[model samples]
Target chain A: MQILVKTFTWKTITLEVEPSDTIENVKAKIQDKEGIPPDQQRLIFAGKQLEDGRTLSDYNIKMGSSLYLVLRLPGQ
Target chain B: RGFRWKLAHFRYLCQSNALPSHVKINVSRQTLFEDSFQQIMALKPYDLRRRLYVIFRGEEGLDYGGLAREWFFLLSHEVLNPMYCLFEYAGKNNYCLQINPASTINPDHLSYFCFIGRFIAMALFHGKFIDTGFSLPFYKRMLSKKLTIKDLESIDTEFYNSLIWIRDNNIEECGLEMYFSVDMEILGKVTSHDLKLGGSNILVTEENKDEYIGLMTEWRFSRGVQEQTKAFLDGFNEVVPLQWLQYFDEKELEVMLCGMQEVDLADWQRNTVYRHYTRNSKQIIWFWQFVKETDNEVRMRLLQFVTGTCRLPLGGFAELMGSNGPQKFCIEKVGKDTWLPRSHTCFNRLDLPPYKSYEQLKEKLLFAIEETE
Candidate 1:
């Protein structure tokens, strides 16, 4: 399934994934694709830090639905 | 996922007889472009870090969504940019072309292959060329220069041949220790701070010199786990409030208070609001604040329902789905979207408005684990 991922800056990188892709792997791709070290990236949908060890479908993020990005750094 | 696999794969990439211009690395998808492969060799390690960040960050940044700089925002310096150090090595070694990447590992460096993979892979796969258009950092000038095999030959390879091999089989920790400590140690004199922050106790020096080495001996172990009970309190004071501590009545709270400060704080500011429902089960259930908080829960439910059954609310009801008037804790409507299984005790306005969902959150959890591991 594909979902729209918008950065804090409002840029979008769509992903095609399966039901089993670990949320951690998704963040890794974000690291590779977005260049934001995984440490600094935050994924929030209606308002939550999407925790790891789960899948996209597991989290209910859908194809047309958007997940917002934000910069989350240490001491922030 | 460990550095060794990354390095092995990178070595496999560079070591290939034919440097295929169109190499495809399946990340989330066909994430790499064709020109990306050959574009790396010309880059200076100096600019590679920032350029890679800008390119990948914007293209795949954690909050990545779409377009070229259309929505791209610059980063503040609170977080350091990603440094693909493998480029330094690949560049100095000329993309690992001259030496046989396929050559046997040095018996002395039994652990070398473990750590070098991902860095090299990151360098070659993600590195890019850019004109900083200024004098390069002096260290980078020296550090990033080409190293010919002729130059390396003078070093006593045979003597290092006897270098006591530390069989660091665990690639993640060993790679980090070697990268931060061993690599820089190769460069110059290290102070206490460096080791304090990143080095393995195996490579300690400076003030703790005596305690670490003690009259000229190999480095020994003294990681914080055994340092002291209070030593565990090191990072604790930062996130907890003195008033919050007052609630415990001089009793020890879960040690979780001392670590990850904000497992949700990003320390997510969360507290569980559990009810004493002795519903025949001592097991406690926590609600998803983000889901149950706003109108998002209803939306989340609709989606997780049609999707899959793997996702379920951490607490509350559930019922067998393939039902024939079946009686169970019905889950069809407790909130369809999967909520994290963690307990959220309370809330603070400190939460950000769901302004946008970029690449995702929670990658850092794994990253944090890797750093500690």
Candidate 2:
């Protein structure tokens, strides 16, 4: 199944993702599609943040589910 | 003797003279947060320590003090409102704000938090009040106080109770399968966060339960949003030195930040100044009697209608703030009997018209407070 990722600077990036795919896996896929690194990415679904160790199914994110992406600011 | 007199004169001059500096604020009501961040962020740190002169774009009112009060009041509501997910009420029964762990989900969460920090410092420095307040632990963290299991109780009572049980019990005989890990729920899903390296596999024992309880307390209070906390502190430190805030405890800091909600009528009347009316004047008598007859809601509305804020500063009415210094509430005679009372919030002055009777005065006063914004 495929899911949609939206960044404020870019249009949605759709990726083929299994329900078993972890949040880190999605970020890595996003990295592959765009030049942005996984470490810089933060994916949010519904009202909760998607943790790297949690799978898409853990957050109930299915195909066509939209996730918002926010990049980390560099600092202490 | 001449040199000694010169030194004494210089000391007196420095002590008596006021520092002259101000930050001019020009923002549209619609884009208050974004505009405020951009303009304030561009200035040097020392510049923020100065006074603020706020002007909302397209408005006719001058930036004496009323506009600045409204800006702080409105901007605070926008930043602290739960819909933004930057903060949440500590518990179901508590309205005090605590940092939302999920705040990092917004890519710009750090910047927003930073903005909030600077905004808070600005409010305190200018003696202005924000509409909302932070939780006790939040204020304690601002004061750099140590957090313990007790602090967790305010944020989550059940979690704190569980930690307390772990602290007070001999877990070996409790017949429990526990580890140096805790389960966290995000929306509907559950995930485990480890207290130590590979902690999910580390079994909890009587000997290590103390460590587990401490780590749990730490995680509950701050470990989750460490960076967000740091950014906020950094922003605040830019304007007000954190050390200066150390003089105040959490309770005093809360009052300093949000001000007292209740209006003390006696304190207010005692501090008020009359422009053209005497204590024995019929209009003044009618005004005081009407206010005494009304409830708290009407009293607060009347205050907000005249002062631009329903809450009083920490020192009560004596500490009522203007753009430059303390501004006391004043009732000045103005216009004819037909005209409604109007306010110059900048000066904390009400332009009250003299009605023929107490009944006539109450009718107009109630109408102005109820109907006007």
Give each model's whole-structure lDDT. 0.29, 0.75
The lDDT of model 1 is 0.29
Model 1 over residues B201-280: C-alpha lDDT tens digits? 45432334334222111211121112221221222222121232322211012111111111221111133222332222
Candidate 2 chain A has its poorest 10 consecutive residues by lDDT at: A67-76
> Could you tell me which residue pairs clash in candidate 2?
none
* Each candidate's DockQ: 0.02, 0.09
C-alpha lDDT of residue B118 in model 2:
87
Q: Write the per-residue lDDT of candidate 2 for residues B35-60, one digit (tens) a residue.
A: 77778878776677666778888774
Per model, the share of native interface contacts recovered reads: 0.00, 0.05
Task: Name model 1 segments beyond 4 Å from true.
Answer: B1-373
